[PDB]
Structures are given as structure tokens and as C-alpha cells.
Amino acid sequence: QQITLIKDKILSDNYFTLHNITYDLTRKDGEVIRHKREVYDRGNGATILLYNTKKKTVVLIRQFRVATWVNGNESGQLIESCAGLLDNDEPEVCIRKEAIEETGYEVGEVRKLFELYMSPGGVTELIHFFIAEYSDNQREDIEVLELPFSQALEMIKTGEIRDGKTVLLLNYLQTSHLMD
Amino acid sequence: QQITLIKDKILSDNYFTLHNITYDLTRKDGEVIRHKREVYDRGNGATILLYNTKKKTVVLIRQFRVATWVNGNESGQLIESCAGLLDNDEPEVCIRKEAIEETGYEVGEVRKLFELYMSPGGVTELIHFFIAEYSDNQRAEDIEVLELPFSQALEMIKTGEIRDGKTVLLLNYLQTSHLMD
């Protein structure tokens, strides 16, 4: 009872849900004041980085993202790590369909790194992170990119790769030395 | 890679604006296919990781977050790096204020790491990342200020006590820079 839900108002329920939540929370002091916060909920998702130890490469994808297009990304094209919304599936089950559907690779074993909130300010979104190696034996609107891991790290510096989850995954592979 | 904006319908304009954008994009075969997508625009922001090579520590903050509380976070409490919305300000200007306001530390020189979309699937949000080493000399409620050893912060990522995207990204970056080695 340290935090109390006063009312969850639905501002929009088109496809995803935008809420206006009113709540009361205590303090280290002893008072209980209420706030009102707009909260957008598009469900949780999963993303995975595909890497190859043989040729020191990674598989990423490129696609048009309107949300970046109307906010600084001229062509709208964004290079990201394969990902998708859970849509009622378990994280791993979902990430396997996504890998197959977006990259064409039917991956084998995968490792779960963590689950992080990507924009806890006004978005509920929690993403499940995975990594997994791929092989050429596992192989329209989405362009599949295969490139050496070192070029992808540099692309973070040049700004060619400017997607949060993707940078997270890449810098993670870097400090794992699985490519070294 | 032809793309044409067809219409921009406002679904909500309470605090931040939620749009339903309809667009036409031409394919590799020449076919024009249209899509409709929700875009939540809450403005861009900036975040900063305050570190100290002297005592090998980092400064972070902790506060309640409704967005996570209604989505798996029992207490709603979240440990994150200092941050805030640009609100018409320049990244470096906004972030300097934030550090002072949220942590009480007035930082000197700051380095910009990069600009990243945190949830490009349906949010416009772009976050500017900064790192800056603090001093106990530069110090001048709803948010708890946490000063803890770097090695612990890093361990807290593995225990899941720290599960915020921008925070984990800044911690790992610091780890790779060798600025604490």
C-alpha cells in the first residue's frame, strides 16, 4: 500500500494502448501526493544478435522505421538487431520465429542476457535480449545485413548504427571475447 | 527506397502526442504497399553516467516509475542513470541541469557518446548519451541518489537489480573504455 492506483484512464486503444494513470505514493517522510502520468503500452518484445565465430561476423537487419523518419532519420532506414513483439509467445519461442522470418536463419541454441525496460519514462516496453551464433547451414521490406563485427562496432562510432538495443548487444558481444 | 507520407492522424494530444501515421513505401519489385503505424512522440532526452576514477565509483538514481510498475516491476522502483527530456534545451545544457537537479553534482567537462533511438518500433524518442567524472567538490525526495562502487553496479546488472536500457548501456560502455582500469 506504499503506492495506490487511483485511476487508469484509456486515452487511446487503437492498436496499442495509451494510458493516463493517476496514483498516490508515500514518501520517506510520510505524505501521500498523487501524480498523473501518461503511459504508452505496446507490449514487450525480444531481440537477438547473430554472430559467427568462424568469419568474425554478425547478422543485423535494416528497415524503414517511421518513428525515426519523423524525428531525425532522413531516409527512415534503421540498422537493427533482429527483433519482434512477443504477441502471446514466450520470449525464446518468439525470437526463433523472428530470426527465421526476418533473417532467414533458423538458429540453434541461444543464450539469454537480460530483460530491460527501454524507455521507462512513458513506455512500458521491456525487451528480452538474446545472442546466438549462426551458420550458412541455417539459412522485401526487410534487408538482411551480414558484416564483420569490427565494421559494426565502427558503425556505432560513425553513427550508421544508432539503435539502443543493437548497441547494447554489440558492446556486449565485444566484452565477452567470444569473437577474440 | 521510395516512401510517401499519406496522412497523420492525431489519436491523443494530452501531454505528449500519439499519431497514427499512414505511409506508402515502394518495394524492390515496384509494388506500392501502404502501412499504418502508431507513433508516440514524447520528445528527445539526454542521460549521463557520473563516474569517479579516484574511488572507482559511479552515481545513479532511483525512483518510482509507473510504466514499469504496471509491467512486472513489483515496487515500481527503478535504478537508472540521471536523465531528462530536452524540453527545448540543447543536449549538453539539459544534461548539466539534470545532473545538478537530480544528483546535486555540478560536473565540469562532459563527453558525448552517441544519439540512440531506444524504442524505434513505435516511439520517436532519441536519447543523447554523456559521461562525465564527478568530484566530491562539485556537490551543491521522490528521487534517491545512489553512489556505489562500479564493480557492484556491474554485478547488479547480472542479478537484474539494474534493468534499465540506458543505464546498462552506459555502465557497459564505461567498462570498455578502461577509464576505471
To the nearest whole Å, the CA of A4 is away from the closest chain B CA by: 11
Alpha-helical (H) ranges within A87-163 are: 91-98, 149-158
- Taking every pair of Cα atoms in chain A, the longest distance, rounded to a whole number of angstroms, is 62
**B85 beta partners:** B45
What gap in Å lies between CA A6 and CA B60, rounded to an integer? Answer: 29
* Interior angle at CA B86, CA B85 and CA B90, nearest 5: 160
Place of cell 503511459: A39
Q: Which residues contact B45 (CB under 8 A, 6 or more apart)?
A: A121, B83, B84, B85, B86, B94, B125, B126, B127, B128
To the nearest whole Å, the CA of A138 is away from the closest chain B CA by: 25
Instruction: Count how many domains chain A has.
Output: 1
SS (H, E, C) chain B: CCEEEEEEEEEECCCCEEEEEEEEEECCCCCEEEEEEEEEECCCEEEEEEEECCCCEEEEEEEECHHHHCCCCCCCEEEECEEEECCCCCHHHHHHHHHHHHHCECCCCCEEEEEEECCCCCECCEEEEEEEECCCCCECCCEEEEEEEHHHHHHHHHHCCCCEHHHHHHHHHHHHHCCCC
Query: Which residues in A lie closer than 8 A to residue B65 (C-beta atoms)?
Result: 117, 120-121
Place of cell 551543491: B140
Place of cell 518495394: B27
- Of B134, B129, B123, B142, nearest to B172 by C-alpha is B129
Instruction: Report strand pairing: B45-52 vs B32-41.
Output: unpaired
What gap in Å lies between CA A40 and CA A43, rounded to an integer? Answer: 9
Q: Checking phi first, is residue A154 left (phi over 0); if not, alpha (psi -120 to 50) or beta?
A: alpha
Q: Which of A12, A68, A168 is the closest to B165 by Cβ?
A: A168
Q: Which residue of B has its CA nearest to A167?
A: B169
Task: Determine contact, residues A46/A87, Cβ cutoff 8 Å.
Answer: no
Q: Which residues precede a break in chain B, with C-to-N distance above 2.5 Å?
A: 140
Q: What is the resolution of this structure in A?
A: 2.4
The reply to whether residue B120 touches residue A80, judged by beta carbons under 8 angstroms, is: yes
Instruction: Report strand pairing: B45-52 vs B57-64.
Output: antiparallel
* Residue range(s) defining the domain that contains residue B181: 1-181
What gap in Å lies between CA A96 and CA A76, rounded to an integer? Answer: 26
Query: Which residues in A lie closer than 8 A to residue B169 (C-beta atoms)?
Result: 164, 167-168, 171
Query: Which residues in A lie closer than 8 A to residue B35 (C-beta atoms)?
Result: 66
Task: Determine contact, residues B167/B80, Cβ cutoff 8 Å.
Answer: yes
Q: Which of B123, B141, B142 is the closest to A123 by Cβ?
A: B123
The grid coordinates of residue B38 equal 502508431
- Of B92, B94, B100, nearest to B61 by C-alpha is B100
Collapse the DSSP code of A142 into the 3-class scheme (helix H, G, I; strand E, B; otherwise coil) and give the result.
strand
Task: Determine contact, residues B126/B119, Cβ cutoff 8 Å.
Answer: no
Place of cell 524505434: B120
Q: Checking phi first, is residue A99 left (phi over 0); if not, alpha (psi -120 to 50) or beta?
A: alpha
**B14 beta partners:** none
To the nearest whole Å, the CA of B124 is away from the closest chain A CA by: 5
Q: Which residues contact B102 (CB under 8 A, 6 or more apart)?
A: B61, B82, B84, B143, B145
DSSP code for A32? -
Environment class of A26 (CB within 10 Å of its CB; exposed 0-12, middle 13-18, buried 19+): middle
Place of cell 535494416: A62
Alpha-helical (H) ranges within chain A are: 66-69, 91-98, 149-158, 164-174
User: Using what technique was this structure determined?
Assistant: X-ray
Query: Which residues in A lie closer than 8 A to residue B33 (C-beta atoms)?
Result: 141
Chains A and B: how many Cβ contacts under 8 Å? Answer: 201
Q: What is the CB-side half-sphere exposure of residue A171 using CA atoms within 13 A?
A: 22
Residue A9, phi then psi, degrees to nearest 5: -90, 135
The grid coordinates of residue B139 equal 556537490
- Of A32, A33, A37, A61, nearest to A47 by C-alpha is A61
**A116, A154, A172, best to mutate vs chain B, most B CBs in 10 Å:** A116
Known binding residues of A: 15, 36-38, 65, 83-85, 98, 102, 125, 140, 165
Environment class of B110 (CB within 10 Å of its CB; exposed 0-12, middle 13-18, buried 19+): middle
Query: Which residues in A lie closer than 8 A to residue B1 (C-beta atoms)?
Result: 64, 75, 77
The reply to whether residue A125 touches residue B119, judged by beta carbons under 8 angstroms, is: yes
**Angle, in degrees to the nearest 10, between helices A164-174 and A149-158:** 130
Quickly count: other Cβ atoms within 10 Å of residue B135's Cβ: 13
What gap in Å lies between CA B175 and CA B149, rounded to an integer? Answer: 13
What gap in Å lies between CA B85 and CA A47, rounded to an integer? Answer: 26
How many residues make up chain A in this entry? 180
N-terminal to C-terminal alpha carbon distance within chain B? 46
Instruction: Report strand pairing: B126-133 vs B45-52.
Output: parallel
What gap in Å lies between CA A16 and CA B136, rounded to an integer? Answer: 45
Task: Determine contact, residues A76/A90, Cβ cutoff 8 Å.
Answer: no
Q: Which residue of A has its CA nearest to B16?
A: A38
CA dihedral (A64, A70, A75, A81) in degrees, to 10, reads -40
How many residues make up chain B in this entry? 181
Task: Determine contact, residues A116/A126, Cβ cutoff 8 Å.
Answer: yes
B78 known member of a binding site: no
Q: Which of A69, A117, A122 is the closest to B165 by Cβ?
A: A117
What gap in Å lies between CA A128 and CA A43, rounded to an integer? Answer: 12
Task: Determine contact, residues A11/A19, Cβ cutoff 8 Å.
Answer: yes
Q: What's the CATH number where B90 sits?
A: 3.90.79.10
